[PDB]
């Protein structure tokens, strides 16, 4: 009856506690650090096969193959070195909003606006790829799919629930339900032990794959957050939102560290991803270009402006050799 | 290149040709996004002509696809951009629910939100003022003033229906780019499909003459 007043009391205690352990003002610490100067990245290759808007991509662990899903009703697996296409998977539901790629490179997960993160099978006999499973159970829409192993996959849907699946059986082995709005993005850990989900409540939560309990909830945003990526260390994560402010949260300090906002930027973020070292922070805007933020001083370093439409996906390779931005032009560039 | 690299490029070109052919074949079908408030009568209009639900039908050598997305409870603005470049937006409005609860005001607010969207600034709208028969007999009991206090006219079907039509048509702030076609759904006829065909061929002719550099 009066329990929400006690909830507000606890929230005030949380904010007081996380504010009492804040004395760095990180910019204050990284003031003495010399900047990266100015980096210029040139489009090495223009992967040109799609005939409609592309919404997601994912680099293979090999750092060679990337799969890119699209709205023409095909996700095609590229070869980033020779521009060649190695597979053309004709998917059933043309409306696809995410894509994954198994760490081993055996399976590729599709799933879009029909509640089914349908995984495919690449390394098989008989040549062509088959639909290994169609993981149904979600009531919103698939927004991200991410591979843990060749048997486990977490999915963030638009019914305020992230679910850990089991490919062999095809059932929700665990359901993460702490959000109030749509879960727009999700990012696994370097150790793949605990992930975070980016929701439409302007709040990212630190989940736990094993138990199934949200450990920490990070607020600070004003609008929907559309992209998450962990710091390569696995103790921090960027958060792209619709307020044009990418923010570096810290999993240990439990609070926001710094914000990446320029006054002449008004568009929303679509994809964020750190470099291999975690120095420069990529961020895909609706200004038809992705900015490269120095992730320790908040000052912009470079600009990757070669797209005619807004970028939907931005992947960094597992060796930091290249980035890949995918716009609604049906072209996805490989910068370097 | 090498022995296997040439064969890999050959495969790449072959599947590229397959993508191009499938794209050319899939670009020939007319897409029709089917909006409408809950219980508007979408089931009636979708059955009349034949997560997401895709219905495919053919009329006069044209292949139509309707994606009635109302069977999805999420934030509309997060997936509504997915349907930009659709030919038309079929927006069926329940006409008999002018009294029910205000529901007409909700339908109007949804129409206002969809017709002035950033993505659908160009795409013409077809709206179906369906269940006209229930509305025709419902007027005798409940006057139209229950929903619209600013109404001034006769309490007859043939005037009240035209008032609802002219009220809905005045929601688009962009009257030059997009046209708003209207039809009072004929229950026992096949003229609903004919009207859809006429509206779609009209917007196609306009888009094709603009495409042809003449208009």
């Amino acid at each position, epitope marked *: 009856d009066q329990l929400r007043q006690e909830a507000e009391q606890l929230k005030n205690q949380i904010r007081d506690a996380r504010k009492a352990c804040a004395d760095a003002t990180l910019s204050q610490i990284t003031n003495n650090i010399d900047p990266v100067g100015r980096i210029q990245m040139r489009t090495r290759r223009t992967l040109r096969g799609h005939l409609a808007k592309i919404y997601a991509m994912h680099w293979g662990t090999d750092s060679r193959l990337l799969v890119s899903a699209s709205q023409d009703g095909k996700l095609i697996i590229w070869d980033s070195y020779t521009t060649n296409k190695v597979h053309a998977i004709p998917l059933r539901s043309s409306w696809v909003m995410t894509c994954a790629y198994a760490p081993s490179g055996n399976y590729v997960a599709c799933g879009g606006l029909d509640n089914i993160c349908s995984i495919y099978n690449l390394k098989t006999r008989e040549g062509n790829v088959r639909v290994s499973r169609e993981l149904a159970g979600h009531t919103g829409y698939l927004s991200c799919c991410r591979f843990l192993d060749d048997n486990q996959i977490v999915t963030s849907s638009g019914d305020t629930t992230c679910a850990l699946w089991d490919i062999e059986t095809g059932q929700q082995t665990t359901t993460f339900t702490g959000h109030t709005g749509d879960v727009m993005s999700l990012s696994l850990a370097p150790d793949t032990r605990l992930f975070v989900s980016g929701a439409c409540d302007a709040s990212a939560k630190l989940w736990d794959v094993r138990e199934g309990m949200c450990r920490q909830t990070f607020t600070g945003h004003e609008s929907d957050i559309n992209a998450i990526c962990f710091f390569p260390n696995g103790n921090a994560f960027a958060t792209g939102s619709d307020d044009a402010t990418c923010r570096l949260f810290d999993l240990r300090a439990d609070q926001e560290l710094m914000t990446y906002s320029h006054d002449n930027i008004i568009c929303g973020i679509t994809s964020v991803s750190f470099s291999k070292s975690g120095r420069l922070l990529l961020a895909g805007y609706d200004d038809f270009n992705c900015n490269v933020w120095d992730a320790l001083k908040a000052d912009r370093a470079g600009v990757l402006a070669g797209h005619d439409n807004r970028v939907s996906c931005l992947g960094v390779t597992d060796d930091g050799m290249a980035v890949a931005t995918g716009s609604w032009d049906s072209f996805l560039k490989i910068w370097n | 290149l*090498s022995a*296997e690299d040439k064969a890999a490029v*050959e495969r790449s070109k072959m599947i590229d040709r397959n993508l191009r052919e499938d794209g050319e074949k899939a670009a020939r079908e007319v897409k029709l996004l089917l909006l409408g408030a809950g219980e508007s009568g979408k089931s009636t209009i979708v059955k009349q002509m034949k997560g997401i639900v895709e219905t495919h039908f053919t009329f006069k050598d044209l292949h139509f696809k309707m994606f009635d997305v109302g069977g999805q409870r999420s934030e509309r603005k997060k997936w509504i951009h997915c349907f930009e470049g659709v030919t038309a937006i079929i927006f069926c409005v329940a006409l008999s629910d002018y009294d029910l609860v205000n529901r007409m005001h909700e339908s109007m607010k949804l129409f206002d939100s969809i017709c002035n969207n950033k993505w659908f600034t160009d795409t013409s709208i077809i709206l179906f003022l369906n269940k006209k028969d229930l509305f025709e007999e419902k007027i005798k009991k409940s006057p139209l003033t229950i929903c619209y206090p600013e109404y001034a006219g006769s309490n007859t079907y043939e005037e009240a229906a035209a008032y609802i039509q002219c009220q809905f048509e005045d929601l688009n702030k962009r009257k030059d780019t997009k046209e708003i076609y209207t039809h009072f759904t004929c229950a026992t006829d096949t003229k609903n499909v004919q009207f859809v065909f006429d509206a779609v061929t009209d917007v196609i002719i306009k888009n094709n003459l603009k495409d042809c550099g003449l208009f």
Partner: single-chain antibody
Amino acid sequence: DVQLVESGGGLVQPGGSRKLSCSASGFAFSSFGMHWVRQAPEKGLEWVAYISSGSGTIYYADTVKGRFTISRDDPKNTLFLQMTSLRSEDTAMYYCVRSIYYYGSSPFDFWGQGTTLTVSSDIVMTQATSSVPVTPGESVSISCRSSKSLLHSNGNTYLYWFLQRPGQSPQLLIYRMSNLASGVPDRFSGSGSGTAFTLTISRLEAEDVGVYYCMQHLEYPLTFGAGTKLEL
């Protein structure tokens, strides 16, 4: 499962004509670059012809250039080798083999059973050793010396190892000198450099005896080794 079967064998008079048909069943045949490889009555394998996916590319061995013709019919899942003016040196078994070419694929993975057809500036793969006796339990090292740098600019060394059991079709063992085939035991492991190669089988057991052919894939026509017979 995957099933390649040939027909059109028997004996033919010299200077005559015959057609060999390989009817594929149980895979996407419409996207597999299919070869023809023959085997003399008591010699190693020899490449004959090749048809690519969609019939866009054709090659032949220097011996059978213009004399044979290869053709595939995708809707029926069949592969035709129409042969004319058969010489006295064509008496052989003819294996139809599938090969799929993309990044990280395993071409020559499956081999047809083959039909005995009797009558009445390339790389030379010098597989020096022709016979060696072995006992089960130990490891034996088979060597295949090439006559040209097989290490391409890409980084791959296009050299394959095939195992032919007594009265069987030779199956792929390793592709590109490093990668193990699909459904092969972990005993086999390839190593070496350009113009020198090795297939070091570890803890050799029974049912593993036969002949081992090394085949370069850098340039046409494909030249198989003389073969090393593992006698028990």
